[PDB]
Symmetry: C2
Subunit: 82 residues, 2 copies
Amino acid sequence: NLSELPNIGKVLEQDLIKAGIKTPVELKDVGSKEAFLRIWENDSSVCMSELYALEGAVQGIRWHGLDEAKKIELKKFHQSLE
Amino acid sequence: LSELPNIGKVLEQDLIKAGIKTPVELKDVGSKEAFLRIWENDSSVCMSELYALEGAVQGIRWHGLDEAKKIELKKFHQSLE
């Protein structure tokens, strides 16, 4: 049911699961960044898209609609990564 | 242009700034070159976004792309810087 929670694609829930994050409530209290990092530990290829997708799912909206402040914040942490 | 699959507002918009304004335009150039064109504007544009477009020219949701082409696409992103 990770397939509900908007923004999440078939391959995103693929690695979310790999990272040990099934169920929406497992990802709600670790939040996007953490989830992001975990899956990144697996494929270095994850990226900004997935970051937004994850925090989109935690707020209950499609990410293009995340509020700005919050998107800089995610950009800063993504770009701070590598 | 956001009438094709896998293309959100942002992807659309940055294709716009890239010189690709239409679904037909996106099909002449294919995805490899479309993507290459925005990479130059945003050196850090996701691989998820190279799939989406190829998903786009062809008529499907990208997770349904045959594994051979994702492997080719992946490889091409890696060649990118």
